[PDB]
């Protein structure tokens, strides 16, 4: 019936003066644009059909052509930025926002989906959707006593579209828009659907990816305990955004970091730092590195939770990018730690894996490691045990590596290595 129409037949039907013919052709276009293999988005655009689809969004008396045109435009807007721009350029944003209040649930949901694709293009279209007034009608669809009474697919689409309104930087979303969205977002973050939870975590991870004022807006809403719970979920699609959000939060103030620790996050890192997914392991070590850049009492919590052996392990064996984050966690630890905390680091076996990574070609890790070695020596100077440390480094072959680094072409590298050689190995 409406399967495998040509663009020229679609155009003929839409250009007819006959609404039912227009409805049939619009469905035929929807089916073309919903095929998995090379949907002819550009051909449909070149045919000039977008302004017609947008007009059809306003045909209140023919809800089927509203639905069919909304679906067609959603699939166009799901493509490249240029294809999304063509939808926006046709006036689709205010048309779709007016459809959010449709009494036909499947039409409102399609409008939600379409606006998610448009906002998801980038910050400019995101802010344009907001300026057209999308947030109030979107939040009204979620203003129910219990989210469980909404259809699962509907709720997932609403969550995903709100997450795109939280996404992207330069600029970040408007502060008033974030404040308007957050209470509903925290409600979704407590829902039981895994997909709603994943996308709510993603939204929170976007809102915390920025200056400490942005982090504070989110933390103030009390979401950190829920995030830590989701950090232990079995679903990798939940753990990943949950961990990103927690990681972002601990880039903030020591007080914001302390709420993560107070919520019990460190007890999850034995698993995260051994997680079979390389990206989870890397992000967990990056998170640890910002925690060890904190206060001495926060370093002490890292010790109390038994996480230094886990950092020794990642340094010993892990994807190189994870090992790089581990070197940062160690150097930050040695930078702000007490003499006793730094000593404990050596007792846990940090020296040998740290020395073995000086053989890495990456120049930055070498500078990070050498700075950690210096801080560890300085802690040993205060106990008069520099010699015993020097012997550890020689026995595991670190002295040979530091000596060879005096020939390194980078300036700061061959500078720091020489200082250690002359200061402690002479």
């Amino acid at each position: 019936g409406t399967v495998n129409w040509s663009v020229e037949d679609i155009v003929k039907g839409i250009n007819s003066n006959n609404l039912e013919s227009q409805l049939q052709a619009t469905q035929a276009a929807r089916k073309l644009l919903s095929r998995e293999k090379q949907p002819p988005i550009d051909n449909i655009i070149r045919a000039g059909l977008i302004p017609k689809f947008v007009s059809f969004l306003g045909k209140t008396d023919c809800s089927p052509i509203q639905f069919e045109s909304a679906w067609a435009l959603t699939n166009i807007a799901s493509g490249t930025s240029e294809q999304t721009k063509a939808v926006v350029d046709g006036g689709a944003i205010p048309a779709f926002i007016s459809l959010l209040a449709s009494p036909h649930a499947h039409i409102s949901e399609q409008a939600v989906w379409a606006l998610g694709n448009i906002a998801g293009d980038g910050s400019a279209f995101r802010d344009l959707v907001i300026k057209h007034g999308a947030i109030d009608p979107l939040l009204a669809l979620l203003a129910v006593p219990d989210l469980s009474t909404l259809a699962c697919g509907y709720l997932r689409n609403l969550t995903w579209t709100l997450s795109n309104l939280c996404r992207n930087k330069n600029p970040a979303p408007p502060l008033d828009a974030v404040e308007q969205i957050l209470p509903t977002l925290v409600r979704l973050l407590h829902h039981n659907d895994p997909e709603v939870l994943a996308d709510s975590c993603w939204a929170i991870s976007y809102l915390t990816d920025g200056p400490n004022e942005r982090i504070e807006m989110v933390v103030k809403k009390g979401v950190v305990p829920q995030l830590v719970k989701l950090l232990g979920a079995t679903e990798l699609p939940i753990v990943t955004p949950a961990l990103r959000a927690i990681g972002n939060i601990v880039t903030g103030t020591d007080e914001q970091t302390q709420k993560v620790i107070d919520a019990g996050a460190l007890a999850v890192f034995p698993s995260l730092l051994t997680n079979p997914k390389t990206n989870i392991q890397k992000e967990a070590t990056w998170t640890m590195s910002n925690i060890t850049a904190g206060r001495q009492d926060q370093i002490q919590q890292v010790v109390n939770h038994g996480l230094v052996p886990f950092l020794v392990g990642v340094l010993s064996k892990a994807d190189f990018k994870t090992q790089k984050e581990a070197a940062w966690a160690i150097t930050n630890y040695t930078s702000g730690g007490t003499v006793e905390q730094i000593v404990y680091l050596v007792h846990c076996g940090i020296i040998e894996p740290l020395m073995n990574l000086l053989s890495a070609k990456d120049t930055k890790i070498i500078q990070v490691i050498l700075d950690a070695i210096s801080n560890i020596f300085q802690a040993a100077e205060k106990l008069g045990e520099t010699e015993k440390l020097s012997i550890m480094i020689e026995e595991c072959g670190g002295l040979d590596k530091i000596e060879a680094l005096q020939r390194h072409e980078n300036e700061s590298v061959y500078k720091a290595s020489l200082n250690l050689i002359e200061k402690y190995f002479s």
């Binding site: 972002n248 601990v250 880039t251 903030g252 910002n290 850049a293 940062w328």
Partner: peptide, 5 residues
């Protein structure tokens, strides 16, 4: 110090 992104 803290390392964003």
């Amino acid at each position: 110090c803290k390392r964003k992104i």
